[PDB]
């Protein structure tokens, strides 16, 4: 731990993407650091222009209680989640019209928690019935189905090389998978209560599971050990979203205490506090380059912090 | 200065006219959760309504649009997806009055009215429903009416000692449920008795929820 500190990092409320009229459950940052899609709960997830607070698309969706959203790496497919299990993939770059729903991917019995696109054709959902299942989009059916937890999975964080991911169970446990054999790699314990979000190391050697007892833990993929614990006795609430930086050095969490807080890759110092939200934050987003961090708090707003 | 995205902010004002239009329409309609245990009788009231995860029943009654987001059966916990329902107008609990003689077929130890009360306090004493006025339906009136005559009802409640009369014992258990709220100032727990008979009990729900928004308008202007 001879690495020098990084000082106090402050970031300001550079933007205010108002326009929503209910809570917000997911703000996934697009494929080209430019557009974000915000998952409402009134009736309408909309896509944003981050640079100029413009809403390019009002998508009135059926499953009126969204719980996650995702922007495809090809930039033209946005997929709402839900709790009535129909992870309906929407189409954006449509010939001659506004917007359309492509394939209503029914086939889960729990509730959709975090669906993230592996590529433009394979959407890896993660639901609340111990099933983080891959799919095939135009077929409308599953391809594989991953079981091996005991409770239910609450989050998903895809690896950069599109080979594997990590499972955010309620089991105080995280699960390593594969995408080309359907096999258990390892399963990592250490937390106490359920966890709510994982993000991934940008080099693909770790993943930070955000628990509900105010602790993050940076695990491994090759050494079979948790590396660094995150704790501060003044803070007591539950994590809702974890995000690394572009380098994996800075860490952006989001808490139930109406604010973020910025830890370290090794030092675990509460450097930044991105306060300014009324209700709790819900989701984060760190771009493919790093020029923005935006939160998705339940007060119907989003603020982008740089 | 606004080169030719001046038509783009023309559009981003146009759908921001419609998000304010549908958002002022979807706030007039009343959203009401109905939550029930296993076989408590929630399938009869949606059959008494007008009209795989949750369902939704956008019925209406007497110049008011309703929504009705039934839970159905999510196999995961109610500790995880229950955040979504904060801001519901008036939840609905439902228990069958007849669901007291049989024991639940999961462990056969705790009674059904001992487990549904153990499910009632989980949703009346939790953070996200401190001011959502419960409207619980005591269900299966007539099938319990025949049930109370041949039953001393000592299996469910040992502490009660009175007559096994429907106008006494079922009127007792109405006060056995609605005294679980630790905040009897903000949660106006109404009650009703309905079965497959006793039709048009949504006339009560139309007049109950109308006595919630006025109690939620007067509370928000400081008056109450």
């Amino acid at each position, epitope marked *: 731990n001879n690495i020098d500190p990084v000082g106090r990092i402050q970031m300001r409320t550079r933007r205010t993407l108002r326009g929503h009229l209910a809570k917000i459950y997911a703000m996934h940052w697009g494929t080209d650091s*430019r*557009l974000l899609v915000s998952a409402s709960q009134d009736g309408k997830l909309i896509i944003w*222009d981050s640079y100029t607070t*413009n809403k*390019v*698309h009002a998508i009135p969706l059926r499953s009126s209680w969204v719980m996650t959203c995702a922007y495809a790496p090809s930039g033209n497919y946005v997929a709402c989640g839900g709790l009535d299990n129909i992870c309906s993939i929407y189409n954006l*770059k449509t*010939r*001659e*019209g*506004n917007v359309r729903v492509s394939r209503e991917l029914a086939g889960h019995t729990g509730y959709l928690s975090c669906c993230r696109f592996l590529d433009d054709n394979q959407i890896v959902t993660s639901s609340g019935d111990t099933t983080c299942a891959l799919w095939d989009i135009e077929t409308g059916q599953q391809t594989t189905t991953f079981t091996g937890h005991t409770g239910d999975v609450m989050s998903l964080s895809l690896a950069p090389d599109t080979r594997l991911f990590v499972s955010g169970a309620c089991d105080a446990s995280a699960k390593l998978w594969d995408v080309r054999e359907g096999m258990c790699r390892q399963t990592f314990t250490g937390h106490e209560s359920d966890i709510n979000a994982i993000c991934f190391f940008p080099n693909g050697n770790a993943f930070a599971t955000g628990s509900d007892d105010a602790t993050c833990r940076l695990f491994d993929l090759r050494a079979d050990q948790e590396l660094m614990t995150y704790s501060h006795d003044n803070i007591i609430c539950g994590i809702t979203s974890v995000s690394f930086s572009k380098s994996g050095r800075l860490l952006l969490a989001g808490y139930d205490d109406f604010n973020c807080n910025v830890w370290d890759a090794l030092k675990a110092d509460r450097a930044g506090v991105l306060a300014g939200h009324d209700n709790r934050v819900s989701c984060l987003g760190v771009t493919d380059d790093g020029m923005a961090v935006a939160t998705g708090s339940w007060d119907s707003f989003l603020k982008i912090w740089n | 200065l606004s*080169a*030719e*995205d*001046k*038509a*783009a902010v*023309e*559009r*981003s004002k*146009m759908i921001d006219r419609n998000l304010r239009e549908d958002g002022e329409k979807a706030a007039r309609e009343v959203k009401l959760l109905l939550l029930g245990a296993g076989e408590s009788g929630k399938n009869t009231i949606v059959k008494q309504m007008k009209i795989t995860g949750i369902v939704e029943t956008h019925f209406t009654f007497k110049d008011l649009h309703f929504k009705m987001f039934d839970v159905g059966a999510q196999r995961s916990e109610r500790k995880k997806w229950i955040h979504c329902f904060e801001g519901v107008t008036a939840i609905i609990f439902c228990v069958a009055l007849s669901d007291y003689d049989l024991v639940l077929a999961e462990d056969e130890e705790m009674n059904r009215m001992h487990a549904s009360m153990k499910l009632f306090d989980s949703i009346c004493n939790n953070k996200w429903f401190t001011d959502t006025s419960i409207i619980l339906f005591l269900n299966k009136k007539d099938l319990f009416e025949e049930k109370i005559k041949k039953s001393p009802l000592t299996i469910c409640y040992p502490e009660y000692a009175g007559s096994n009369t429907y106008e006494e014992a079922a009127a007792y258990i109405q006060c056995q449920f609605e005294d679980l709220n630790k905040r009897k100032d903000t949660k106006e727990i109404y009650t009703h008795f309905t079965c497959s008979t006793d039709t048009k009990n949504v006339q009560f729900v139309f007049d109950a929820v109308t006595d919630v928004i006025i109690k939620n308008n007067l509370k928000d202007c400081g008056l109450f």
Partner: single-chain antibody, 232 residues
Framework: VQLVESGGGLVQPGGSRKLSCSAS????????MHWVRQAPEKGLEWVAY????????YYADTVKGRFTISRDDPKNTLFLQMTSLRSEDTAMYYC??????????????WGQGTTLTVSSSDIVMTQATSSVPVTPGESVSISCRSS???????????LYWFLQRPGQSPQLLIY???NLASGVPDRFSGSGSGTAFTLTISRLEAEDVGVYYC?????????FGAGTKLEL
């Protein structure tokens, strides 16, 4: 996917007519509708435009005051009613569908076009060549210039290429001078400075031999130039 027009005939100068570009095949209400016309031997010329939801109504400065225009959105049409018809307004009128957001493609689908026989400040760009004869299989590049730096400070150049196959509507090819549209192959390429522009048409084929065009889109009104015809 479909646009139809009507309202032709032979009127003396001093008459009136209500043109009717009826709309179908798409969600018409959330589109921008332009009214580019073509001289019977010379180039294209913008006339009028209505925004989405009858918003920013414009006009061309040459017809600034004489023509009335509206849209019946429950009928999905355009009411180009003309008053005091002049002899210089002989055109085969086109009715263009445009849409404006980030990463969009305005002027993507055009009208089919009906003719109109009448009897008897401004940013202006220029063409490069009126005609260039090329035998196919040669990878011809064409160029264009203007009288302004069309490289506005938000980082994008507002010039839209086109192509008119001889007889039919002017199909778009390249939008924002560097982005391939939908329906063109991956052999074209555009580039350009603030003022000068170009287009690389590599490996010529059948039927993509018509007259080319250009359109600045920095400020209104819109210019087209005489258009580079391609010969064989």
């Amino acid at each position: 996917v479909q646009l139809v027009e009507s309202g032709g005939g032979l009127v003396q100068p001093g008459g009136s007519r209500k043109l009717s570009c009826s709309a179908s095949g798409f969600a018409f209400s959330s589109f921008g509708m332009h009214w580019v016309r073509q001289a019977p031997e010379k180039g294209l010329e913008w006339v009028a435009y209505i925004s989405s939801g009858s918003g920013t109504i414009y006009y061309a400065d040459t017809v600034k005051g004489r023509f009335t225009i509206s849209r019946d959105d429950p009928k999905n049409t355009l009411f180009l009613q003309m008053t005091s018809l002049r002899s210089e307004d002989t055109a085969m009128y086109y009715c263009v569908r445009s849409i404006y957001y980030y990463g969009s493609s305005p002027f993507d689908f055009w009208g089919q076009g009906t003719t109109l026989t009448v009897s008897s400040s401004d940013i202006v760009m220029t063409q490069a060549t009126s005609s260039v004869p090329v035998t196919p299989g040669e990878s011809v590049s064409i160029s264009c210039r203007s009288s302004k730096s069309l490289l506005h400070s938000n980082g994008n150049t507002y010039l839209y290429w086109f192509l008119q196959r001889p007889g039919q509507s002017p199909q778009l090819l390249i939008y924002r001078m560097s982005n391939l549209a939908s329906g063109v192959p991956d052999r074209f390429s555009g580039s350009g400075s603030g003022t000068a522009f170009t287009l690389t048409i590599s490996r010529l084929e059948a039927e993509d031999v018509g007259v080319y065009y250009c359109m600045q889109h920095l400020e209104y009104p819109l210019t087209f130039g005489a258009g580079t015809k391609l010969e064989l």
